[PDB]
Scaffold this active site. Sequence first.
Site, PDB file in Angstrom:
ATOM      1  N   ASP A   1      -4.478   8.070   4.018  1.00 49.37           N
ATOM      2  CA  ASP A   1      -4.603   6.641   3.762  1.00 49.37           C
ATOM      3  C   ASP A   1      -5.874   6.396   2.952  1.00 49.37           C
ATOM      4  O   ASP A   1      -6.980   6.482   3.489  1.00 49.37           O
ATOM      5  CB  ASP A   1      -4.687   5.887   5.087  1.00 49.37           C
ATOM      6  CG  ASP A   1      -4.755   4.383   4.905  1.00 49.37           C
ATOM      7  OD1 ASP A   1      -4.867   3.911   3.747  1.00 49.37           O
ATOM      8  OD2 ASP A   1      -4.702   3.667   5.931  1.00 49.37           O
TER       9      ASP A   1
ATOM     10  N   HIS B   1       0.824  -1.203   0.000  1.00 52.19           N
ATOM     11  CA  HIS B   1       0.000   0.000   0.000  1.00 52.19           C
ATOM     12  C   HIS B   1       0.865   1.263   0.000  1.00 52.19           C
ATOM     13  O   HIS B   1       1.931   1.284   0.608  1.00 52.19           O
ATOM     14  CB  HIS B   1      -0.909  -0.039   1.238  1.00 52.19           C
ATOM     15  CG  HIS B   1      -1.923   1.065   1.293  1.00 52.19           C
ATOM     16  ND1 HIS B   1      -2.623   1.483   0.190  1.00 52.19           N
ATOM     17  CD2 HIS B   1      -2.356   1.819   2.331  1.00 52.19           C
ATOM     18  CE1 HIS B   1      -3.444   2.463   0.536  1.00 52.19           C
ATOM     19  NE2 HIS B   1      -3.300   2.683   1.832  1.00 52.19           N
TER      20      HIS B   1
ATOM     21  N   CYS C   1      -3.973   3.004  -5.120  1.00 53.19           N
ATOM     22  CA  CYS C   1      -3.436   3.817  -4.017  1.00 53.19           C
ATOM     23  C   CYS C   1      -2.444   4.905  -4.435  1.00 53.19           C
ATOM     24  O   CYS C   1      -2.551   6.050  -3.989  1.00 53.19           O
ATOM     25  CB  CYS C   1      -2.833   2.929  -2.921  1.00 53.19           C
ATOM     26  SG  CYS C   1      -1.510   1.809  -3.468  1.00 53.19           S
TER      27      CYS C   1
HETATM   28  S1  LIG Z   1      -2.483   0.348  -4.449  1.00 47.55           S
HETATM   29  C1  LIG Z   1      -2.396  -1.036  -3.346  1.00 47.55           C
HETATM   30  C2  LIG Z   1      -3.496  -0.954  -2.337  1.00 47.55           C
HETATM   31  N1  LIG Z   1      -3.374  -2.114  -1.511  1.00 47.55           N
HETATM   32  C3  LIG Z   1      -4.541  -2.871  -1.151  1.00 47.55           C
HETATM   33  O1  LIG Z   1      -5.637  -2.525  -1.548  1.00 47.55           O
HETATM   34  C4  LIG Z   1      -4.404  -4.117  -0.274  1.00 47.55           C
HETATM   35  C5  LIG Z   1      -5.659  -4.932  -0.484  1.00 47.55           C
HETATM   36  N2  LIG Z   1      -5.474  -6.352  -0.117  1.00 47.55           N
HETATM   37  C6  LIG Z   1      -5.186  -7.353  -1.121  1.00 47.55           C
HETATM   38  O2  LIG Z   1      -5.077  -7.006  -2.276  1.00 47.55           O
HETATM   39  C7  LIG Z   1      -5.025  -8.792  -0.647  1.00 47.55           C
HETATM   40  O3  LIG Z   1      -3.906  -8.842   0.205  1.00 47.55           O
HETATM   41  C8  LIG Z   1      -4.893  -9.895  -1.713  1.00 47.55           C
HETATM   42  C9  LIG Z   1      -5.861  -9.757  -2.868  1.00 47.55           C
HETATM   43  C10 LIG Z   1      -5.230 -11.227  -1.025  1.00 47.55           C
HETATM   44  C11 LIG Z   1      -3.452  -9.955  -2.246  1.00 47.55           C
HETATM   45  O4  LIG Z   1      -2.913 -11.276  -2.075  1.00 47.55           O
HETATM   46  P1  LIG Z   1      -1.773 -11.558  -1.008  1.00 47.55           P
HETATM   47  O5  LIG Z   1      -2.295 -11.355   0.387  1.00 47.55           O
HETATM   48  O6  LIG Z   1      -1.302 -12.987  -1.160  1.00 47.55           O
HETATM   49  O7  LIG Z   1      -0.544 -10.537  -1.262  1.00 47.55           O
HETATM   50  P2  LIG Z   1       0.884 -10.649  -0.541  1.00 47.55           P
HETATM   51  O8  LIG Z   1       1.412  -9.258  -0.259  1.00 47.55           O
HETATM   52  O9  LIG Z   1       0.732 -11.428   0.752  1.00 47.55           O
HETATM   53  O10 LIG Z   1       1.898 -11.437  -1.540  1.00 47.55           O
HETATM   54  C12 LIG Z   1       1.352 -12.016  -2.723  1.00 47.55           C
HETATM   55  C13 LIG Z   1       2.438 -12.568  -3.566  1.00 47.55           C
HETATM   56  O11 LIG Z   1       3.727 -11.865  -3.264  1.00 47.55           O
HETATM   57  C14 LIG Z   1       4.620 -12.891  -2.670  1.00 47.55           C
HETATM   58  N3  LIG Z   1       5.321 -12.330  -1.561  1.00 47.55           N
HETATM   59  C15 LIG Z   1       6.301 -12.028  -1.712  1.00 47.55           C
HETATM   60  N4  LIG Z   1       6.769 -11.615  -0.871  1.00 47.55           N
HETATM   61  C16 LIG Z   1       6.007 -11.534   0.292  1.00 47.55           C
HETATM   62  C17 LIG Z   1       6.118 -11.101   1.620  1.00 47.55           C
HETATM   63  N5  LIG Z   1       7.276 -10.534   2.180  1.00 47.55           N
HETATM   64  N6  LIG Z   1       4.762 -11.336   2.423  1.00 47.55           N
HETATM   65  C18 LIG Z   1       3.681 -11.982   1.505  1.00 47.55           C
HETATM   66  N7  LIG Z   1       3.842 -12.299   0.250  1.00 47.55           N
HETATM   67  C19 LIG Z   1       4.748 -12.145  -0.300  1.00 47.55           C
HETATM   68  C20 LIG Z   1       3.782 -14.078  -2.376  1.00 47.55           C
HETATM   69  O12 LIG Z   1       4.519 -15.293  -2.655  1.00 47.55           O
HETATM   70  C21 LIG Z   1       2.636 -13.991  -3.282  1.00 47.55           C
HETATM   71  O13 LIG Z   1       2.943 -14.671  -4.545  1.00 47.55           O
HETATM   72  P3  LIG Z   1       1.779 -14.987  -5.581  1.00 47.55           P
HETATM   73  O14 LIG Z   1       2.306 -15.921  -6.645  1.00 47.55           O
HETATM   74  O15 LIG Z   1       1.291 -13.714  -6.244  1.00 47.55           O
HETATM   75  O16 LIG Z   1       0.629 -15.648  -4.856  1.00 47.55           O
END
Ligand SMILES: *SCCNC(=O)CCNC(=O)[C@H](O)C(C)(C)COP(=O)(O)OP(=O)(O)OC[C@H]1O[C@@H](n2cnc3c(N)ncnc32)[C@H](O)[C@@H]1OP(=O)(O)O
Length: 267
Positions: free
Chosen positions: A158, A141, A211
């Site tokens: 936020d 975010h 965001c």
């Molecule tokens: S502008 C951005 C505004 N942000 C939001 O609106 C946040 C809203 N919430 C979401 O989008 C959800 O969190 C969802 C849709 C579930 C996103 O999925 P994730 O929860 O799995 O996302 P993660 O951050 O946990 O990570 C997803 C992918 O990235 C890899 N990864 C790498 N590194 C990490 C760390 N340090 N912690 C978690 N994940 C992490 C994951 O392996 C994962 O890989 P994928 O192959 O994409 O599943």
Amino acid sequence: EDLLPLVPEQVFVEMYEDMARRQTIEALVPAWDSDIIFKCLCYFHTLYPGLIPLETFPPATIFNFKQKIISILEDKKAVLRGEPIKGPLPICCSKENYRRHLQRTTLLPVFMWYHPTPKTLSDTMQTMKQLAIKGSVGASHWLLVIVDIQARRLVYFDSLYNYVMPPENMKKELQSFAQQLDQVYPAYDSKKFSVKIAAKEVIQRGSGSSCGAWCCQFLHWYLKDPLTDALNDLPVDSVERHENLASFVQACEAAVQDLPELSWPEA
Ligand SMILES: *SCCNC(=O)CCNC(=O)[C@H](O)C(C)(C)COP(=O)(O)OP(=O)(O)OC[C@H]1O[C@@H](n2cnc3c(N)ncnc32)[C@H](O)[C@@H]1OP(=O)(O)O
């Protein structure tokens, strides 16, 4: 016996409406990463010389944004007195032009990148790298802290309202920080830094990617009017909200298209 309820041969039909709206929204306003945000800030500086286009590479985090702001304000204080600067220097700006920006600036646009999992600065940067490599936003975010030096106001934005912590907890943290800034960057008339938590509700409802653009739009609204109530005058419909934001993004992306990459405008 009782007549069994019909189960449609469409697995996802119950979610079609919500899925469709989200898809439309994600398509209207995709993710804005560090580099386009920086270009937008450079552009904003040409329109509003008070804004210093701080680099977003690497961006601040919740673990170091306060230290980052203090280093900058101490350096501006030093520049105004003909003293040396001690803070980390920008990579896309000459040392002299940086001093000029510090002398001129009245507003610090501090973008903070955040993820719920990392618990240190280093781990946050590592998480940022992993997500970039796989082309994923994930649970990451963008947050904006505006340091309005002229008005002595800290504005926290936020677009997800309470993604990091409840607004009252961020208010408390920032209120303690504000009194620290009163000592670090004192005012002649003893006017105290005040704190504003900008969003009273979720702003980017229906999007997991807008965001960065929202932060920049709010910043632009703030630059137009430091007392902007624009967040209260938003369309209720989330698709409509992102349609307007899409127009902003398009205008911004057009405006920076032919502007120089990886370099600060002259102060
Ligand atoms: S502008 C951005 C505004 N942000 C939001 O609106 C946040 C809203 N919430 C979401 O989008 C959800 O969190 C969802 C849709 C579930 C996103 O999925 P994730 O929860 O799995 O996302 P993660 O951050 O946990 O990570 C997803 C992918 O990235 C890899 N990864 C790498 N590194 C990490 C760390 N340090 N912690 C978690 N994940 C992490 C994951 O392996 C994962 O890989 P994928 O192959 O994409 O599943």
